[PDB]
Amino acid sequence: VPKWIQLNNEIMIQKDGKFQFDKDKEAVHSYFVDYINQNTVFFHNLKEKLDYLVENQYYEEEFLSLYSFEDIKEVFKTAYAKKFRFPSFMSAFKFYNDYALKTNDKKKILERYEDRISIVALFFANGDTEKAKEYVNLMINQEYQPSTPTFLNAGRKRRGELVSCFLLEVNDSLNDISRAIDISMQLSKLGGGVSLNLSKLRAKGEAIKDVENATKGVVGVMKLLDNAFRYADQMGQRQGSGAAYLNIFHRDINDFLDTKKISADEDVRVKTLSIGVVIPDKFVELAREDKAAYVFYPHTIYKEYGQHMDEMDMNEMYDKFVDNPRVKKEKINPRKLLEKLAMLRSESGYPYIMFQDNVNKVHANNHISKVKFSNLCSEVLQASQVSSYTDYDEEDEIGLDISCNLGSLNILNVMEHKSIEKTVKLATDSLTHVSETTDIRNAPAVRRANKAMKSIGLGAMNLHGYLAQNGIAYESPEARDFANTFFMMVNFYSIQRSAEIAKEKGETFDQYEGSTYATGEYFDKYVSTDFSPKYEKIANLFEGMHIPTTEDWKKLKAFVAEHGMYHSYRLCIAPTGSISYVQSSTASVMPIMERIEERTYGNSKTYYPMPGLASNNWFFYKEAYDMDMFKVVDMIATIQQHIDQGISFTLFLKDTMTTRDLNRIDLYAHHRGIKTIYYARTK
Amino acid sequence: VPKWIQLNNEIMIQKDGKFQFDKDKEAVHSYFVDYINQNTVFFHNLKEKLDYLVENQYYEEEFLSLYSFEDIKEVFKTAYAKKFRFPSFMSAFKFYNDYALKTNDKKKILERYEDRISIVALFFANGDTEKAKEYVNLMINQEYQPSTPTFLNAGRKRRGELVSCFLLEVNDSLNDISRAIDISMQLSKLGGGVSLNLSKLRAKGEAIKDVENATKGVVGVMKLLDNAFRYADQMGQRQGSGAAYLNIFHRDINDFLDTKKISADEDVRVKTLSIGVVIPDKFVELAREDKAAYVFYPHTIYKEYGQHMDEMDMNEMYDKFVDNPRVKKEKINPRKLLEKLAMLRSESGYPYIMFQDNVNKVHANNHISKVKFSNLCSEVLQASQVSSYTDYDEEDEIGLDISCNLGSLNILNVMEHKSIEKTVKLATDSLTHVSETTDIRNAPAVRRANKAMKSIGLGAMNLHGYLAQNGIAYESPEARDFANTFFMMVNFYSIQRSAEIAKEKGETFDQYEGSTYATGEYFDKYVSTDFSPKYEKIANLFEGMHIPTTEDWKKLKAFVAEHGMYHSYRLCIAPTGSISYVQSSTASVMPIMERIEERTYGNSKTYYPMPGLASNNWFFYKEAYDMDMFKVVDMIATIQQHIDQGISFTLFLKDTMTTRDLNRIDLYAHHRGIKTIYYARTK
Amino acid sequence: TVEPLKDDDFYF
Amino acid sequence: TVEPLKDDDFYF
């Protein structure tokens, strides 16, 4: 075994009844000295390194040409002036195995952490030396973390897309379905995950040009999408991941769920296609009263009313559909469907549960469209318009398709530096640059919506790490108070930066005037309620930082009304997975699954304690499965009220908790305002 | 049991040791009197019938508007003036179960045979009453049978397309693969079989933009196309049948062949994709000499030479590929690969063996393109150009994708009427009309090739039936002499009609000037060799008919040089396994599989004696399995020399014969000039 | 288990 | 029944 791995295994070797947590720093030192410093290509100067990387098609030349070499050298000096040291071996291992640039033969390492960060900052700044140095300070302090696509591929020629997600609306036509397959493959080859809304597709047994019982339902389209994502497997290095979302009132909802059953035959089962279920409040009401529900055939509704099933408010039009003889449906049991959802999530973790009315109750851009579906990570909730892809040599009607411009704030490092405002504004600027520089030619709706909506996703991570390292239990009300204050601050400064960008560019996002930002309805709870901490301990955490008040929110509302808002969406909390290791952070705002992660790499067993774990804060780092899921729902809903998009909310379930417990958690999440539920992780 | 089925069941009940073949006429009479007349809705006059069918979306009003009602009435009268009587129960059963128009509830019969024929004739004539009556006489005499799509869907509103088959060239890109999937689903929606050329797709383990060993080969595309055809399976009326063709020098040839293995896992196994293998003469040369052969990576050849592997001459470029270090390849054993082909055909009937050099040595349009693959029935051998489908908002380079409009001559009825010339010319006119009226908006290359090439397929059937009813053994040299003479006359009159159409319309098919028709190379063997019958018995069959002599062929060659040719391709012999029953004809030019076919439709077995089978000609109707396959190869090669496209040549093998016998038959077919081999049926 | 829902799991 | 090609089968 290697020396660093052997030293890492001494974490679990307990002496005097305590874990040898100090051995981890020795593991980082051994790892670097024995592997990294030996297998990193070193050049006589930064000029030679840059020439080698651009000439050998490792870096793009366009973004480096915006700076003189003096500016680039100063930026790299700023990155290395911090003298950043990885505090855990797993952080360095993750970076130098996944995100560090390597030679074409993968034998050596071309990029350090201070090199990847410098290149990403130079990409973000776009010719500005001071902005590049600010980004370098932001990332080397680990206050803000660009998403895995953005961090990996910024300024590199051998890349994919910096966009993490692609949310596609699939219209009810063979041409539209074929274009959905094409766009799904063209966006999977770019690396980003693709989510598709299949609620517009007509159900099984529907008519294709007045011949009845002709359709095979959305399950055939899921088969096509699953094989399309399998084909676009990105070399197999990361398997093609795709999501499919269906409204729970869609007739195919039972067959939609039947594909995730283990007992399901290979003739119906889909493997690479994750599934999500969109649940309007009407379904929850029907389940609550234990009255028979109806799943409708979408094409009958489209023929009768001229509008798609998912474009109509089901809370208002459910009765109209039911008493309509020209609308086809079959009676179902909403409580039986809820139990089926609970057991499917217990067995496989699917489907993602999207509470449509919870999303659209506080959705700012309902005028553009209601949020009909979420992304593969079940955290992006944006307005989308379907695209009517017509026959060849006929002009297509291009709609709006959602894309992830993701970035995560490290709550621990953000609040240690007392720079919530600066970090949020710089992250918003970086995400704006990523959205602007994204130009996807094979996805027309994605490109059009990226140009028009200018939506970005600014998430946060290391919530549990910050709370445990500050002596706050995740389920404690003080933790919820801190999350309320912190995410209200984040929302305030994200809105402020969006309005500042709109003022400086003279343009807002498309159809901004109809949004609640323009009408001032979005800021109602912010100008009516004070989100300052209610606990003295929590208020001390924000000391040295100006917490926005009701009057400050009124000034921000006036500023937005006068100048507009550049981004339709700004905040969405992604799961923050493999990049959380590099930032030495807990994943997302979720609680930690295990105090010490047991990971297998090759023939070695590697251990990763969560950052800041020690004897004093051992019980503050409570495992997620040990937590009360209701209090985690409370925490997320406290965070959710300050996030305009959704949060990737994973349910951590014990083996002893039945499907009724999972359904209770789901219904409490719906009752508390949770927008989406990502996963049901059973231990 | 129905009375007609019970009377048909009396065929095998032998009295006096002889089959009761006279019971089939009783069976058809009972069928009509007790089911068809009772379940046929009758109108007071033809005006009421036409009005009801047009108003109820059964007929197109456009094609009936070019005729005054008196003209349509007289066309119907001359259709019923024949007083056509079906000779067998199976003919009427097949027609009134598969092609006769029925009401929306499929409970009553709206179309007689004479009404289907009248409607198809009125569609063919396009405003000409005399031509409509000529078509009516042609079809009611059963001299010419339009293909199943044409016969079933001519003049109907609830119709797909009149084209029986489509051939798509798939280029080596994700855009082209996605568009190929889209076009395959669109054309399967239209009801026609789709064949795809996967030889341009780069091999498994190839590089995608400097990313090496990332491709899944052609097998991933086979999985995509298989699921596309399953999805677009014509709603379940008939399972979506698609074809994939790959050159035998493609690297994925073994993976391509392994898809049909029973032992193959579901992750590599296709189920609705028929597979075909294109064998150049170079492969046969390598197998004969037992030298180790190399299958090549297509993308390496494209990078080195700028042309796709199937676009270059294998016989010339093989040594250059092998001696090229930049062309990646893997060593195979051509004889072991031939044995694998033979065992695959023995176990499953796949692949379709296509001898590329046997096609291109007599291919008239090699200047346009070599024939790189065949159709789903391995009989459509036409030049095709690949379409370079670019990104969205980028103009695509549309090529030529083969569309085949099929039609069959009933050799028995054509010869008994002594009307080879008139039948061939009228069939050519009808196929030209079908090609002209056919437009496909979702397949740009199919539409472009239909407009430019104007290629039609005029097949033939009831060869074995005519020979046996004339006391000629199918394997006898007299049968081959008759096939030679009859198909030489068919080719002569097809060329004459094509030249007459080109003269009347003033236009030839695109790139006609570079074809052998314009240069006269096509007519060399016709102006040099006399194809009159060498046997007095065969020559007596053509009594009262002018057999084209050498001087007549010289005159036709001069006429073609002066006026051109309207159709790039005219003759192609399809299996015609379904319409053969209605016409009381043996399927294709193939020998009969069984003297009395046993068929189960429901809970009752329905025996079908061969057309004209009796006691005096029992041994002339020799079953194809008992026949020498070398003699059948000789027959097909005699026919093939007068057919510009291919022939659906099915190999009928006994279980006693090994894979070496199958390989011997394959190599004899290659040596005798057979272009394609369809199936290997084992008894 | 597969414990079914009751009327009291829909109010909190 | 796999029977190997033994040559003389490519000549007729």
Ligand SMILES: Nc1ncnc2c1ncn2[C@@H]1O[C@H](COP(=O)(O)OP(=O)(O)OP(=O)(O)O)[C@@H](O)[C@H]1O
């Ligand atoms: N714990 C660590 N985390 C990250 N990088 C490390 C770590 N330990 C060593 N390195 C890397 O290895 C190099 C040499 O390791 P070492 O600890 O001996 O450095 P040093 O020269 O003593 O430190 P300094 O430059 O801070 O004076 C460092 O410059 C750094 O790039």
Ligand SMILES: Nc1ncnc2c1ncn2[C@@H]1O[C@H](COP(=O)(O)OP(=O)(O)OP(=O)(O)O)[C@@H](O)[C@H]1O
């Ligand atoms: N063998 C058959 N083939 C086709 N149609 C048939 C056949 N037998 C009966 N029919 C149909 O049933 C009807 C009644 O049969 P039948 O032969 O008694 O009629 P028909 O017109 O009086 O006969 P004929 O041709 O001797 O004048 C026919 O007009 C025809 O429509």
Ligand SMILES: Cc1cn([C@H]2C[C@H](O)[C@@H](COP(=O)(O)OP(=O)(O)OP(=O)(O)O)O2)c(=O)[nH]c1=O
């Ligand atoms: C994207 C992708 C391509 N391919 C294969 C199939 C196509 O025939 C082949 C062509 O891909 P292309 O789409 O042409 O790749 P590219 O144009 O971006 O780069 P390059 O032209 O240099 O190749 O790649 C896969 O097998 N799987 C995949 O996921």
Ligand SMILES: Cc1cn([C@H]2C[C@H](O)[C@@H](COP(=O)(O)OP(=O)(O)OP(=O)(O)O)O2)c(=O)[nH]c1=O
């Ligand atoms: C062609 C085809 C369509 N469909 C379904 C999926 C599509 O959502 C739906 C629409 O297909 P369309 O392409 O819209 O077919 P159409 O326009 O002829 O039908 P209509 O005019 O009645 O709208 O039909 C299948 O399920 N299988 C098929 O093979």
Ligand SMILES: Nc1nc2c(ncn2[C@@H]2O[C@H](COP(=O)(O)OP(=O)(O)O)[C@@H](O)[C@H]2O)c(=O)[nH]1
């Ligand atoms: N010399 C060198 N510097 C690098 C390399 N990669 C990143 N750097 C950083 O880029 C900055 C420029 O260093 P350098 O060109 O050597 O400046 P110099 O000391 O004045 O010669 C330094 O702060 C380095 O930390 C490399 O491969 N070689």
Ligand SMILES: Nc1nc2c(ncn2[C@@H]2O[C@H](COP(=O)(O)OP(=O)(O)O)[C@@H](O)[C@H]2O)c(=O)[nH]1
């Ligand atoms: N009357 C009638 N004739 C039909 C129908 N379908 C096809 N036909 C044929 O169309 C032709 C129409 O001629 P018809 O109107 O009957 O002339 P009539 O005998 O002088 O009244 C006839 O020869 C029929 O064989 C139908 O439903 N009713």
Ligand SMILES: [Mg+2]
């Ligand atoms: Mg449609």
Ligand SMILES: [Mg+2]
């Ligand atoms: Mg390409």
